[PDB]
Design a protein around this ligand. Structure first.
Ligand SMILES: CC(C)Nc1ccc2nnc([C@@H](C)c3c[nH]c4ncccc34)n2n1
Length: 289
């Protein structure tokens, strides 16, 4: 039960730009389509009926935490790009934490999509998906927005097979707990096997550490969703990288694309490509297919 009067008025105004009235939203609480730490995701209908995904934040009961989460995520309403998940709105009600309403992604998350044996995406398909992610990240980087959890599990595919960079802003959560570990300097659950070396060392995230994560995402694509470093313990990821060791080239990964991956994992952040450069390089590789 969250009272608006307790929240910062500036934040309230920002939220009121995208409010959805309860009478306009039907949530199917018997139809769970995702599970996060802050709450589940449910099938919903937004009223003319629009199929949507409704993200619950009910596990966040403290007003300080609700305020922080909304403050960090509301900028989402200001983003608009074909490869970035949009916000439909926020449903405020008398009982319960705010519901976040997002576009429904018919084809689910990118990792499960490519792992699906009936799909059997080709190398061209997979590089195409990677190019789409690069374009979405190019946009976010241009807004000076650092994602911090880029991974194949956190991108989604809509009905037209357009890839949306997701799991950020008001949609931020941990949707697969297997890949987050507290074995890091912050003590919080972090995606350590997607993190840049300097993030593991300094606890800081930048666009250049997003580039590192993107390289891991490319590797995930080329392996059709294999888990990275299955043979490296979470205790050992930092030293593994310090020794200069990196993910190995996937069997069906083109040599030039592996070169792109290696560039993304340069130990010096400033030496890694920008997302603009990545779009250019991957577009050329894609075009050979
Ligand atoms: C498979 C699902 C649970 N994974 C993800 C990954 C990232 C992400 N970012 N937002 C969401 C949810 C809120 C979501 C938005 N649209 C959806 N369409 C279908 C299923 C889940 C969502 N996720 N979900």
């Amino acid at each position: 039960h969250i009272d608006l009067s307790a929240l910062n008025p500036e934040l309230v105004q920002a939220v009121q730009h995208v409010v959805i009235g309860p009478s306009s939203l039907i949530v199917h609480f018997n139809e769970v389509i995702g599970r996060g730490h802050f709450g589940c995701v449910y099938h919903g209908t937004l009223l003319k009926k629009i199929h949507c995904a409704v993200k619950s934040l009910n596990r966040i009961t403290d007003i300080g935490e609700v305020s922080q989460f909304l403050t960090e995520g509301i900028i989402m309403k200001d983003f608009s790009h074909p490869n970035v998940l949009s916000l439909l709105g926020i449903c405020l009600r008398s009982e319960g934490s705010p519901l976040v309403v997002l576009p429904y992604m018919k084809h689910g998350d990118l990792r499960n999509f490519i792992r699906n044996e009936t799909h059997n995406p080709t190398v061209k398909d997979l590089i195409g998906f990677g190019l789409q992610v690069a374009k979405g990240m190019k946009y976010l980087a241009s807004k000076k927005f650092v994602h911090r959890d880029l991974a194949a599990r956190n991108c989604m595919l809509d009905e037209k097979f357009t890839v949306k960079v997701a799991d950020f802003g008001l949609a931020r959560d941990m949707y697969d707990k297997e890949y987050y570990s507290v074995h890091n300097k912050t003590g919080a659950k972090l995606p350590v096997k997607w993190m840049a070396l300097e993030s593991l060392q300094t606890q800081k995230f930048t666009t250049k550490s997003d580039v590192w994560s993107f390289g891991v995402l490319l590797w995930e694509l080329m392996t059709r969703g294999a888990p990275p470093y299955p043979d490296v313990n979470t205790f050992d990821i930092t030293v593994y990288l310090l020794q200069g060791r990196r993910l190995l080239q996937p069997e069906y990964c083109p040599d030039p694309l592996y070169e792109v991956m290696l560039k993304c994992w340069h130990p010096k952040a400033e030496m890694r490509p920008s997302f603009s450069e990545l779009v250019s390089r991957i577009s050329a590789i894609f075009s050979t297919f």
